[PDB]
């Protein structure tokens, strides 16, 4: 049972350690691009969220890197687009070079951003492909996202989200909410909107994830929260590949998995509910919660609970039924897709 899941986790771990050289090459290109973006008046304030130089969206693709370059906005003014809760318009300004009226243009900023990188990479066989920019290094992928940074308090749409109060405590929720939030240019299908991003909060939670501060720092306190998440992400990625030729799994992403996972951490706040010896049942409970979300068509954003990731306006019912059928098959046959 769990021995099979553990074998999967061991090969997933080994596959992601052998990236030393690649990681170096990414750091090199990133340092180059940030130094050069800074030569422009608009981008002098660019920088890495944390001096973490990279992340991986797909657990099964260690050669595919993801980085975010952030840019601080001194006094940002947000205005909600069409009642979406997650999509906003952004309103002596080093970005006045891109204001189309009182609105900051996602199209203008990205065009300049893409030009500097294209030019800077024309100076290691690196090619640009049109996540603002995707770079192909040698024949290593690097996705670069541009985000605005705001140190103002979080938008009211997040007021009832991040319900980690019975898990990570009320004190942590307050401290987390004093941190900046980010905006990424993103078409609200309108093209000039920006989407809220709390990716940096999710990272701090996953790496400081127990009620006990010493959770996973000793043998007595080993939990399987991170193992369960990894197994859920790998499940989706493998199914997305088998049917990459079909349209049914195109709208599903690792964001859906993480959101469902955080919701189960809220439901199961005690470390004793995530004991490593119970990897099998904990995983099965995470799969079951995710399936319940697919059948009832409900997956609330962890930070914005009024935004339903699984509504019929985003993903049709047939796609959710197809995914449900595939995961249920895998669950009843001890996940053969893991071995494929």
Ligand X SMILES: *O=[C@]1(*)O(*)C(*)(*)(C2(*)=C([C])[N]N(C3=NC4=C(Cl)C(Cl)=[C][C]=C4[N]3)C2=O)C2(*)(*)(*)=[C@](*)(*)[C@](*)(*)=[C]C(*)=C12(*)(*)*
* Range in contact with ligand X (rule: CB under 6 A) among 83-91, 219-227, 247-255, 289-297: 247-255
Q: What angle do CA 237, 241, 243 make, to 5 degrees?
A: 120
* Range in contact with ligand X (rule: CB under 6 A) among 115-123, 134-142, 232-240, 266-274: 232-240
For residue 92, the minimal CB distance to ligand X (Å) is 31
Cβ-Cβ contacts under 8 Å for 336 (sequence gap 6 or more): 330
Separation between Cα atoms, residue 231 and residue 8, nearest integer Å:
8
Instruction: Check residue 268 and report its DSSP letter.
Output: S
Contact string (CB under 8 A) for a second copy, positions 155-194, x = contact = ----------xx-xxxxx----------------------
Of 222, 238, 235, the closest CA to residue 261 belongs to 235
For residue 253, the minimal CB distance to ligand X (Å) is 4
Residues lying near ligand LLS in the complex (CB under 6 A) are found at 57, 66, 86, 131, 143, 145, 184, 195-199, 255, 301, 303-304, 307
**Cβ-based nearer residue to ligand LLS, 269 or 305:** 305
Contact string (CB under 8 A) for a second copy, positions 192-231, x = contact = ----------------x-xxxxx--x--------------
For residue 85, the minimal CB distance to ligand X (Å) is 16
Separation between Cα atoms, residue 127 and residue 29, nearest integer Å:
12
The answer to whether the beta carbons of residues 14 and 129 sit under 8 Å apart is: no
Separation between Cα atoms, residue 168 and residue 17, nearest integer Å:
29
The answer to whether the beta carbons of residues 215 and 168 sit under 8 Å apart is: no
Tell whether residue 205 is among the known ligand binding residues. no
The answer to whether the beta carbons of residues 145 and 132 sit under 8 Å apart is: yes
Q: Which conformational region is residue 247 in: left (phi greater than 0), alpha (psi within -120 to 50 degrees), or beta?
A: alpha
**Cβ-based nearer residue to a second copy, 200 or 233:** 200
Separation between Cα atoms, residue 210 and residue 271, nearest integer Å:
6
For residue 198, the minimal CB distance to ligand LLS (Å) is 5
Residue 236: which of ligand LLS, ligand X, a second copy, none does it interact with, CB under 5 to 8 A by kind?
ligand X
Residues annotated within the binding site for ATP are 52, 64-66, 199-202, 233, 254-258
- Interface contacts to a second copy, rule CB under 8 A: 165-166, 168-172, 208, 210-214, 217
């Amino acid at each position: 049972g769990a021995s099979k899941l553990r074998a999967v986790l061991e090969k997933l771990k080994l596959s992601r350690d052998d990236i030393s050289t690649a990681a170096g090459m990414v750091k090199g290109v990133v340092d180059h691009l940030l130094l050069r973006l800074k030569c422009d008046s608009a981008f002098r304030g660019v920088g890495l969220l944390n001096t973490s130089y990279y992340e991986h969206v797909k657990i099964s693709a260690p050669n595919e890197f993801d980085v975010m370059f952030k840019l601080e906005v001194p006094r940002i003014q947000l205005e909600e687009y069409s009642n979406t809760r997650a999509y906003y318009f952004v309103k002596e300004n080093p970005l006045s070079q891109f204001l189309e009226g009182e609105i900051l243009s996602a199209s203008k900023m990205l065009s300049k951003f893409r030009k500097i990188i294209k030019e800077e990479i024309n100076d290691t066989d690196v090619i640009m492909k049109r996540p603002a920019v995707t770079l192909l290094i040698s024949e290593i992928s690097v996705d670069i996202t541009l985000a605005l940074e705001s140190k103002s308090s979080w938008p009211a749409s997040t007021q009832e989200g991040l319900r980690i109060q019975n898990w990570l405590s009320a004190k942590v929720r307050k401290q987390l909410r004093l941190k900046p939030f980010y905006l990424v240019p993103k078409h609200a299908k309108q093209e000039e909107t920006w989407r809220l991003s709390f990716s940096h909060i999710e990272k701090e939670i996953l790496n400081n994830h127990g009620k006990s501060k010493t959770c996973c720092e000793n043998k007595e306190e080993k939990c399987c929260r991170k193992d369960c998440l990894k197994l859920m992400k790998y499940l989706l990625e493998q199914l997305k590949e088998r049917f990459k030729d079909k349209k049914h799994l195109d709208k599903f992403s690792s964001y859906h998995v993480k959101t469902a996972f955080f919701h189960v951490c809220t439901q199961n706040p005690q470390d004793s509910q995530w004991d490593r010896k119970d990897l099998g049942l904990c995983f099965d409970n995470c799969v079951t919660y995710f399936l319940q979300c697919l059948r009832t068509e409900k997956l609330e954003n962890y930070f914005i609970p009024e935004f339903n990731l699984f509504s019929s306006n985003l993903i049709d019912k047939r796609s959710k039924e197809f995914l449900t059928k595939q995961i249920e098959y895998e669950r009843n046959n001890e996940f053969p897709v893991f071995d494929e």
